[PDB]
Symmetry: C3
């Protein structure tokens, strides 16, 4: 399977929370799958009170888009750092072997680009992130991470080897942010990326985030921007956290089959109320919806979710099933 001789294809990446089209089980043999990504430095609004962040993102989103291949395929990435950026960047893929995950071979300054190829020989969801020498934590907490999903060639399996399949996949990236506050107790605003550095590092050292958000901002996946599904659909929820632990939960649901450490050759666990994604990794859960209504998907440290921002919504269409749950007596006066 020399690589140079296998066929090559090109994927067109989409923005979170969707994932690009792909097949679960494939008949095909190894390919070289080609992708391109641009780093974008930009100032973004992260809450509803106008707080800003001097951010660093892959393709302009938080998280960066999810890339999907099959086990045995070769990933061939072109990383582009445009001249309007001010800093150098690179990429570390946790799914790759050697060279600090690719970081040593992808150091690009503003105005440069580079291309790397690596064999994706282990299946699972894996984090990728920016990692420049001496500036690692700051480039990651500023937004630069995302997920690489490597499917087993024959699709996902339960513990006895039976096939599992999903109808839809969503990708959630969770970000712990360290926004400095001034003498007045109001969040600071910075003219450039470099100006933010000094103060940010000071908040970082306290280990206490100011905000924790899904996909870029408080409320990113709530109300009008809720994820959607229907009764009877099976959804794959991919959740990444490149720096800090989190504990996802679906209020009104469960994780039917969950790979919390995110590595598909291991058997999944079933019926979980709440699962655990270790900082520096991505995990995955399947759930088949049985009841319609609004569901909340969140980090079940409820202060982190409701005070700091780690909460989203899934709106589901269908018909109520009164056997699973039914109101016998609505709220009413106690009997006197």
């Amino acid at each position: 399977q020399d690589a140079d001789k296998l066929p090559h294809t090109k994927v067109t990446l989409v923005a979170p929370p969707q994932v690009h089209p792909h097949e679960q089980a494939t008949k095909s043999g190894p390919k070289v799958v080609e992708f391109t990504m641009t780093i974008e430095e930009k100032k973004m609004v992260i809450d509803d009170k106008g707080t800003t962040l001097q951010a660093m993102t892959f393709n302009g989103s938080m998280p960066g888009p999810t890339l999907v291949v099959h086990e045995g395929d070769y990933v061939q990435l072109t990383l582009v750092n445009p001249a309007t950026n001010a800093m150098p960047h690179n990429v570390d893929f946790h799914g790759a072997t050697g060279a600090l995950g690719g970081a040593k071979l992808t150091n690009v300054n503003p105005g440069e680009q580079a291309t790397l190829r690596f064999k994706a020989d282990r299946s699972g969801t894996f984090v990728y992130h920016c990692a420049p020498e001496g500036m690692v934590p700051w480039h990651v907490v500023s937004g630069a991470s995302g997920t690489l999903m490597v499917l087993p060639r024959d699709g996902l399996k339960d513990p006895q080897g039976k096939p599992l399949h999903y109808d839809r996949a969503y990708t959630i990236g969770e970000f712990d942010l360290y926004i400095p506050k001034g003498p007045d107790g109001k969040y600071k605003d910075y003219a450039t990326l470099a100006e933010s550095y000094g103060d940010t590092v000071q908040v970082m050292r306290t280990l206490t985030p100011s905000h924790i958000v899904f996909n870029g901002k408080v409320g990113a996946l709530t109300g009008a921007n809720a994820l959607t599904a229907k009764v009877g659909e099976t959804v794959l929820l991919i959740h990444s956290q490149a720096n800090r632990d989190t504990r996802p939960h679906l209020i009104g649901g469960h994780g039917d089959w969950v790979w919390e450490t995110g590595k598909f050759a291991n058997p999944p666990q079933r019926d979980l109320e709440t699962w655990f994604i270790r900082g520096g990794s991505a995990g995955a859960a399947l759930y088949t919806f049985k009841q319609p209504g609004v569901y909340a998907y969140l980090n079940h440290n409820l202060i982190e979710a409701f005070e700091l921002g780690a909460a989203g919504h899934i709106k589901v269409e269908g018909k109520w099933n009164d056997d699973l749950m039914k109101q016998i007596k609505a709220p009413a006066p106690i009997p006197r």
Copy 2:
């Protein structure tokens, strides 16, 4: 198994750390099991220096009592909010499917009551807690959570399918508390529940608890109130944490068989020194005692346990076994 036609029974709930009588493996078929609980708002003393908390509890205890049923049974709960309370409450069962775990169908104001029924179709220990719209974190950290244990109809099993059985079950609820301190560095005391709100939320946002207690207060399960057992007994230790991670350990023991994510259809792990309960869940461990003496059961972040309060005792009767452990030479002068 329409529900309306199955037989119905009524359980009488007891206070932690005990659990109400129940059977492990049952011959019976699905029932509708009926329970009733009252919410009680009250001011409680949480340490030995007189610190107080404006608390919200199910049935007046922290945690709320454990409810036990078998897989396939239907839980039918009556939730009662007496007129002496000041706020509205509800309940979210993580063992239920739909309607935000039951929260949408149980919103009761002071002086009202409501009844919900749901099918318990997944086995394991599951957290339940209060969850009112816009006030979630505060009602949970104030004390309102507990555990629902759903046993598999044929009892608990080891990984090769062999039967496991316990002689006694205890339930431990761990609570992270955020009690405000004043200019003097002394804990504040509040006349009403509502008066405490503003300051509490400020301590919460720091993510640093003032106290972490088992079952309501520092020393709740120590010295005279230790849990009890005897050499040769097999105990089931149920441990819940509705908001924050913890890591239980038995000094001088192990977890023989442990379900850390708390879901009985998965195989347990064996011989654990320390296990991990994710915030927003309940887990379970079995241990058979082999040596008499005092054992400490605690959160093995030792600052959390010894400085903040997360430590209890188990006193065990029986005969010392010198093969497992023996003192060869007692403490004595080094040889000169």
Copy 3:
């Protein structure tokens, strides 16, 4: 297997990060394995800016040395507290059953020594630490912990029962330190151990460490003191944390087979990017190197690793394998 009749041998302990010579699978039957350790109170330099810590260590190192036996063997330890120390100490082995892990039978004051024997009947890596009544957290965070590895008599196994073997073993101890800072924002220095107490306990209660180090100091295992291996070697990485959670990761590698809860009778997980060691435990991972170069081994909360100190290096000799990873186009000007 009365103990008094089995053969007895004596092991000679070495300093971290190495582990003393031992066999994986053994033909032998139960022995009484004898070890001796001295507690040493000493002031040590923990970073590169001269910060000091008033430390308490087993045999003068952080962590204490790893002790290795086989399942069914009896551990016989002599603990020695020299007259130049100021405090009393003891030891709690998480691998032992009864007497608070041995703590009640090993209380030695300066100038005394004691000998304990316990049966090592459960396999896995287990933490040991000092635990004196009323002073537990402080003696542990000051440096007094290490690992006891109990191998299964027939060596380590994969999940289908196939044999796994390693060529080299390293031991990493991770320590969260709470060094007080003064009005000037400079770290305090203390003349004696007892003088440090009062202030340390105050930093501890904030739950926010000032430093988190591998093996004693920032940079202990970096650059010139990197761990070493070669392409084709299989290494066993043992990682202990007696007080706080951590999440290890090998940049450019994976955990081929990992026991995160560290208990060898359970099947390992494979292909992990990042794993989780619960505070109060030790875990183990195997990895076979496939590419030469420098690898970083660290806690993947990247603030904890790069700002606070939890990062080390592994330098590996061998020949680059261009199929796993290859640079297609080096960094260069974007095309105009």
